[PDB]
Design an enzyme around this catalytic site. Structure first.
Site, PDB file in Angstrom:
ATOM      1  N   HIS D 150       0.851  -1.182   0.000  1.00 61.84           N
ATOM      2  CA  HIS D 150       0.000   0.000   0.000  1.00 61.84           C
ATOM      3  C   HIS D 150       0.890   1.236   0.000  1.00 61.84           C
ATOM      4  CE1 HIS D 150       0.640  -0.653   4.396  1.00 61.84           C
ATOM      5  NE2 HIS D 150       0.786   0.659   4.369  1.00 61.84           N
ATOM      6  N   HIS D 206      -5.984  -2.186   4.018  1.00 61.00           N
ATOM      7  CA  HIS D 206      -5.865  -0.982   3.204  1.00 61.00           C
ATOM      8  C   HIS D 206      -4.923  -1.225   2.035  1.00 61.00           C
ATOM      9  CE1 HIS D 206      -2.365  -1.061   5.598  1.00 61.00           C
ATOM     10  NE2 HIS D 206      -2.016   0.209   5.505  1.00 61.00           N
ATOM     11  N   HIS D 220       4.878   7.208   3.067  1.00 57.42           N
ATOM     12  CA  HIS D 220       5.672   6.002   2.866  1.00 57.42           C
ATOM     13  C   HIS D 220       4.978   5.096   1.861  1.00 57.42           C
ATOM     14  CE1 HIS D 220       2.866   4.521   6.034  1.00 57.42           C
ATOM     15  NE2 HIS D 220       2.940   3.401   5.338  1.00 57.42           N
ATOM     16  N   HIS D 252       0.827  -1.483  14.665  1.00 58.47           N
ATOM     17  CA  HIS D 252      -0.148  -0.426  14.444  1.00 58.47           C
ATOM     18  C   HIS D 252      -1.456  -0.759  15.150  1.00 58.47           C
ATOM     19  CE1 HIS D 252       2.183   1.957  11.694  1.00 58.47           C
ATOM     20  NE2 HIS D 252       2.293   0.988  10.803  1.00 58.47           N
ATOM     21  N   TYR D 261       9.244   1.369  10.369  1.00 58.54           N
ATOM     22  CA  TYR D 261       9.437   2.534   9.516  1.00 58.54           C
ATOM     23  C   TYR D 261      10.931   2.771   9.340  1.00 58.54           C
ATOM     24  CZ  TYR D 261       4.488   3.898   9.684  1.00 58.54           C
ATOM     25  OH  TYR D 261       3.119   3.942   9.549  1.00 58.54           O
ATOM     26  N   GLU D 271       8.109   1.044   4.620  1.00 53.91           N
ATOM     27  CA  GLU D 271       7.518   0.254   5.691  1.00 53.91           C
ATOM     28  C   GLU D 271       7.523  -1.220   5.321  1.00 53.91           C
ATOM     29  OE1 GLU D 271       3.370   0.666   6.294  1.00 53.91           O
ATOM     30  OE2 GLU D 271       3.382  -0.227   8.296  1.00 53.91           O
TER      31      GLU D 271
HETATM   32  C1  LIG Z   1      -1.698   3.540  11.367  1.00 53.50           C
HETATM   33  C2  LIG Z   1      -1.139   2.723  10.207  1.00 53.50           C
HETATM   34  C3  LIG Z   1      -1.636   1.455   9.955  1.00 53.50           C
HETATM   35  C4  LIG Z   1      -1.130   0.713   8.902  1.00 53.50           C
HETATM   36  C5  LIG Z   1      -0.126   1.237   8.102  1.00 53.50           C
HETATM   37  O1  LIG Z   1       0.375   0.472   7.040  1.00 53.50           O
HETATM   38  C6  LIG Z   1       0.371   2.508   8.355  1.00 53.50           C
HETATM   39  O2  LIG Z   1       1.385   3.049   7.553  1.00 53.50           O
HETATM   40  C7  LIG Z   1      -0.137   3.250   9.409  1.00 53.50           C
HETATM   41 CA   LIG Z   2      -3.052  -4.188   0.995  1.00 52.36          CA
HETATM   42 FE   LIG Z   3       1.679   1.710   6.026  1.00 50.86          FE
END
Ligand SMILES: Cc1ccc(O)c(O)c1
Ligand SMILES: [Ca+2]
Ligand SMILES: [Fe+3]
Ligand SMILES: Cc1ccc(O)c(O)c1
Ligand SMILES: Cc1ccc(O)c(O)c1
Ligand SMILES: Cc1ccc(O)c(O)c1
Ligand SMILES: [Ca+2]
Ligand SMILES: [Ca+2]
Ligand SMILES: [Ca+2]
Ligand SMILES: [Fe+3]
Ligand SMILES: [Fe+3]
Ligand SMILES: [Fe+3]
Lengths: 314, 314, 314, 314
Positions: D150, D206, D220, D252, D261, D271
């Site tokens: 992502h 995500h 990132h 997270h 990170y 990441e």
């Molecule tokens: C809060 C959060 C959750 C998932 C991620 O991949 C990210 O960069 C930040």
């Molecule tokens: Ca994904």
């Molecule tokens: Fe992320």
């Protein structure tokens, strides 16, 4: 003969209710007894003696004393003669000085810390038993720490004044208690000054450790975890209890152990230490860490020596 | 003083090219030397002595001898007198009997196996060094085994004939070599017969172990892994090399160690042993496993004693 | 539009008390309701709908039906027309046919299994909530399964008689329900016969799967776990409950998922499936597994197709 | 129909030799081609298209554009009409605008970032193949990242001026590209202001995410890892390459994903994201994170919002 492992650590706490909540909910220990003076004694699930942590009411944080268990009662007399020949005065508190605890040889390390040696403590057994036992017990709480693993003492160090109690403690526990040095941090010109040492009686990387500081104090007491995954679970537990975390999950360069630094509700630092790391052996060469890589020896992943590591202790 | 750990194991192999391929590609060892007789010597990455595995050309599988390292050279004389007072005859092969190996005290266990004790072996160092070392080395092969961890010997046992070399080996290594018993499997009426024992010199659950059988032989030699995840990675490696797996990834009831049983291209069983399990201590009670739970003591997850465990050895 | 995921599975159990004990203690599910007919409904902690498992009293094991959730209510009419154009007759059970369940489109797969599609089921939420939720809930039981992940159906297959309901089910769920094929096992001459298929609506390797057999039945329903370490913990739980384990912890060649096969107290096989494996995508090529490596596709670590996998089902 | 996943990200780097070294040695990617303009294209081992990362020589860091793959070529025309009806002007770069890349629909998000949609990119396959493939490839480098997972964009936000491009981006990708919102951070009075959103096309938490900032930029790009153990291994790799780590291993609160990170040799944040977290579903309630727990939503273990997270981007 001689020392087997770390036995217990006596800590000063300012809020007994909150401290007992922390060591029970976060690390998963069980309160085993409370004496007439309000002192609270706790043990981990994979320990078999009565207690490995003493919480004493106080106006401040810090450590009262540190105790190591020896194999047999006669070891105390033999170690007492070795210690007193070296130049350290000892005394012998007899049975019952602490509840459920045999007689204790008492003396001060060169760094000024009080150390006790005992051979007898009341047996209660682990939380999984010893007849067809499960690998882990049902109803574990929090991080489910196996046992009190080691303790890191801050030791007064002033090279320009000729003071290095890390070096004097290291020579003392080796020559008198027959610890053997596993790793060391060398600073100063060409690494000619021992600033941090890790010594063992077990075949684990360290059962005691000394780090230099402006004064002598307690850096942390550590509790053993199995794997890196348990460090993740332990970190989740600290978040659920809003534990103030000193250092997030990472790996130590020394001992190779994965770790978390966090505080109890009085300021004392605790550590959840994961993994064997390696099999410490008396024929194994001492791992030397140089001053240019001082950050990687402590916090390996970042190479960044946290200011909190060398500035915050009790 | 005395024994530190397991030193090396000498195995009989029928195809040297295939056996060396297996111990290099699957377990990640490195060939360190080959003597004039075709014997091949190998070491793991987290070992510092020259070799922990000897492969000797033979018409069959099996074990030649088993070696343990002692702390100092003078330990051999003291242990020799203890062993010979017990009733076992010893001999002393001097320096160079094996390449890069000091003098060796040689004797037979009551089970008939040849055991050797040495104090000196050529130092080469681990694959990560001892000055600011990495936790693991780049370019690890296969499972990346840390070190030769322990060895399980099949010991001749015939209770109706009054023969139990597991009990005689257990009494021998305790009274003469000062091993201490960590766990035991008790069979027979009310658990009155020792059928399997696990003994240690380190603070790990076992450095040697004996299991009863119709004859005396080699059950397996084991190699240490860090975590359960490494057992998964090791199992993937065995699949990529079409290694014949005896027992798929599971956990031992004894020692709590996670494990895989697999064979080398000659039939000798190997084990990838993961985790410390627990801190073995001389004041820790001996974990007793009863005959009704014999399957859970070996293969904890299933409670099912594999026929291969008690029927296949070399 | 269309199918989102597997919704629930209705199983036949012969001892309701023991079956509910198993799915609550071993897999960590919670009983959510019991209807007037004695049927028991259960859900996992990381599910938000009311139930994903129905246990119905019966004289035998096996599966009653299998249900998948669709995005919206209007999807049922559109999918109904697609299914009935293909040649499969459907019916519409209205609201309340099952408790806390909306109307359901009911039909039979070519393999003979009853499949239901619903758009509405009573929302209860996960056990961690949706406002600042924890990653996992306190007081998880057993393996702590996240959710019902997929189901593997045994499908009647007789190539010499021209019968292959695995191929007919695969074509049906693709052309009518818009599943997409992720992996397949090809047997017969040159891999010209589909014997096992894995299809998905999510971006996980499979939400439904078909394997050939002499008759049509239920191979297993699976529950998701996070990591390989959770598979170890799940295996420990099954040992503490003396769960009959079909296959000890290992990895599937297909989907790359780590797994355990085990039985409920009626004979129905369950699976604790760990890991995403990979991101299934409609542009990803279908992973083909050939007949010569049939064992590695199912049990990757051994390359050994268990007789129990292809002989035991309900 | 529509978007499948993130396709590639084009980054500005100031030292091409060092940037290629970083993405090859640390994350384990492979350089797949270099065009006449010096741009370098890289892919991960578990991706099958030609490239997921473009490195372009520049005087600064930052992101050129962000690309997502759609299912079929006709999706571009349909999505183009939806986007242009919403009010965003689009253009169509035809085949070969980028090497080994089909035609691309080009437009700007409300936040000002350039986004591209393509249906065709040259197929090369994963590093394990699609016929009886291994779970992982031999000779993986560094962290061995599976795929570009992502991207988190910093989006210009000024509530007192009525500007919130996080809210406008969230409404755009939902109404035009049919993303669905999985989690959100609500700040302002009573959580009435969207400051961070996480949206998906896959069933992962995500595929794109927006976070508010003073200007619009790149926070990132992330790469997928399997387990928490791989995060430990990835952290060891960054130490061996002296990678500047932004955030040490932790979890997270949002997505439940374990993370690290770290920066590339130009300042762009990367990441290593571990775990599925949960199965994102269109009927799943949107996880809401409130402003009082803003630190736990980002860095769950500490509850401490790093100043670097909200102050450092390119
Ligand atoms: C809060 C959060 C959750 C998932 C991620 O991949 C990210 O960069 C930040
Ligand atoms: Ca994904
Ligand atoms: Fe992320
Ligand atoms: C550097 C280091 C290594 C191991 C420890 O347990 C510790 O507290 C510090
Ligand atoms: C029962 C058992 C426990 C540990 C071992 O290493 C082994 O080989 C057997
Ligand atoms: C071969 C295979 C792969 C994944 C599964 O979930 C399963 O049941 C079988
Ligand atoms: Ca220790
Ligand atoms: Ca050992
Ligand atoms: Ca699935
Ligand atoms: Fe420590
Ligand atoms: Fe073993
Ligand atoms: Fe399955």
């Amino acid at each position: 003969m001689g020392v087997l492992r770390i036995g217990h650590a006596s800590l000063k706490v300012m809020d007994m209710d909150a401290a007992v909540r922390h060591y029970e909910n976060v690390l998963g220990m069980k309160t085993t007894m409370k004496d007439k003076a309000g002192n609270v004694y706790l043990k981990c699930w994979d320990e078999w003696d009565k207690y490995s942590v003493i919480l004493t009411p106080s106006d401040q944080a810090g450590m009262n004393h540190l105790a190591y268990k020896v194999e047999k009662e006669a070891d105390l007399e033999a170690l007492q003669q070795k210690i007193e020949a070296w130049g350290v005065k000892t005394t012998m508190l007899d049975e019952g000085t602490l509840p459920s605890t045999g007689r204790m040889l008492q003396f001060k390390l060169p760094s000024g810390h009080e150390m006790r040696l005992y051979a007898s403590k009341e047996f209660v057994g682990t939380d999984v038993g010893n007849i067809n036992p499960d690998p882990w017990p049902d109803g574990l709480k929090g991080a489910g720490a196996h046992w009190l693993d080691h303790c890191l003492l801050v030791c007064e160090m002033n090279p320009e004044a000729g003071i290095n109690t890390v070096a004097d403690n290291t020579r003392f526990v080796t020559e008198c208690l027959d610890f053997f040095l596993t790793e060391q941090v060398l600073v100063g010109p060409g690494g000619s000054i021992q600033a941090t040492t890790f010594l063992a009686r077990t075949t684990t990387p360290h059962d005691i450790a000394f780090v230099g500081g402006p004064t002598s104090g307690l850096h942390h007491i550590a509790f053993f975890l199995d794997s890196w995954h348990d460090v993740l679970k332990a970190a989740d537990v600290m978040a659920k209890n809003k534990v103030r975390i000193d250092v997030a999950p990472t790996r130590h360069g020394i001992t190779r152990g994965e770790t978390i630094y966090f505080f109890d509700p009085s300021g004392n630092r605790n550590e959840t230490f994961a993994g064997l790391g390696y099999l410490a052996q008396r024929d194994r060469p001492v791992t030397t860490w140089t001053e240019d890589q001082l950050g990687s020896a402590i916090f390996y992943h970042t190479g960044y020596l946290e200011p909190s590591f060398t500035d915050v202790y009790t």
